[PDB]
Amino acid sequence: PNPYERGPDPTEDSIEAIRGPFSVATERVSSFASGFGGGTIYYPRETDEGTFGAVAVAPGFTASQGSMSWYGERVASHGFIVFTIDTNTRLDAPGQRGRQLLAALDYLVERSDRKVRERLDPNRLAVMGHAMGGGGSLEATVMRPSLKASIPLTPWHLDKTWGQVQVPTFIIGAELDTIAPVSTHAKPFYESLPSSLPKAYMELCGATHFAPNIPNTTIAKYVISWLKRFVDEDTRYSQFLCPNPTDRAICEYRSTCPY
Numbered sequence: 001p002n003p004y005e006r007g008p009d010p011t012e013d014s015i016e017a018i019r020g021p022f023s024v025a026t027e028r029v030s031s032f033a034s035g036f037g038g039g040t041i042y043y044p045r046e047t048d049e050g051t052f053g054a055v056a057v058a059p060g061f062t063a064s065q066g067s068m069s070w071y072g073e074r075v076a077s078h079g080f081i082v083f084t085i086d087t088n089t090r091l092d093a094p095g096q097r098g099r100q101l102l103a104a105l106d107y108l109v110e111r112s113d114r115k116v117r118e119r120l121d122p123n124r125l126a127v128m129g130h131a132m133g134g135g136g137s138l139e140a141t142v143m144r145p146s147l148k149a150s151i152p153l154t155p156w157h158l159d160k161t162w163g164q165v166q167v168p169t170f171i172i173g174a175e176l177d178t179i180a181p182v183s184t185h186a187k188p189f190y191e192s193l194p195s196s197l198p199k200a201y202m203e204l205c206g207a208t209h210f211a212p213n214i215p216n217t218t219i220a221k222y223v224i225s226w227l228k229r230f231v232d233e234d235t236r237y238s239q240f241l242c243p244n245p246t247d248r249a250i251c252e253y254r255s256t257c258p259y
């Protein structure tokens with residue numbers, strides 16, 4: 001009965017697939033837009049099952065949306081509006097990246113053209129980001145507690161305490177990261193999140209700081225599952241999140257399961 005359920009019942013094969021059951025169309029947003037550097041909107045074409053939630057996606061320091069473009073088709077085809085953004089400058093700090101993620105979401109709600117706006121549920125928004133943009137994902141949830149989900153990917157931030165976060169948060173770390181080492185960024189972040197929050201931490205064996213910038217089935221399958229569970233309230237995806245996954249590519253996993 002869940003009004004936000006989209007797509008057939010999932011399997012291990014369907015969440016690993018490079019293409020979900022929805023066909024995807026795109027829209028380029030100029031950098032002239034206020035509040036962020038523009039980006040690319042990826043949306044599902046089919047409307048017979050209802051509107052969709054959205055996730056804004058930020059890159060890291062010195063990087064552009066091209067470092068995140070593969071999340072666009074992969075995630076949107078499982079039933080989401082996906083907005084891979086550019087920041088105002090490639091040198092913006094994490095707090096700036098959080099502010100601009102929220103401006104990108106507000107663009108979708110308030111400014112987008114009819115093709116996008118009529119496919120969107122403005123009540124169900126989420127944030128995701130890489131490196132400093134993962135620090136921005138944390139920042140955005142403090143700025144806006146009504147967000148449905150947050151996914152910081154190999155996140156970087158000098159602030160190590162996130163005990164006021166109220167948004168379900170999934171931190172992905174890279175075991176051999178030397179730029180944002182898991183021992184000094186991802187793990188203290190995760191441990192400082194409220195213990196009553198639905199949250200998870202996944203550490204990828206042998207991975208580096210730029211693992212999130214190339215197609216990665218392990219990232220994709222649980223990014224999709226997390227957005228499904230919390231943006232769509234879709235408990236069909238709880239089976240992949242709880243108990244903790246044991247994929248060979250995972251070297252540590254922590255969670256507040258069951259949820």
Ligand SMILES: COC(=O)c1ccc(P(=O)(O)OCCOCc2ccccc2)cc1
Pocket residue numbers: 060061062063130131132133155156179180
């Ligand atoms: C300001 O403090 C820092 O130097 C610094 C702190 C954090 C991060 P990041 O968002 O986790 O990195 C993501 C992109 O790789 C960085 C990079 C790429 C290419 C050439 C040099 C550096 C980056 C830099």
Ligand SMILES: [Ca+2]
Pocket residue numbers: 031032033034035036037038088
């Ligand atoms: Ca702009």
Ligand SMILES: [Ca+2]
Pocket residue numbers: 244252253254
């Ligand atoms: Ca464990």
Ligand SMILES: [Cl-]
Pocket residue numbers: 176177178179208209210
């Ligand atoms: Cl690295």
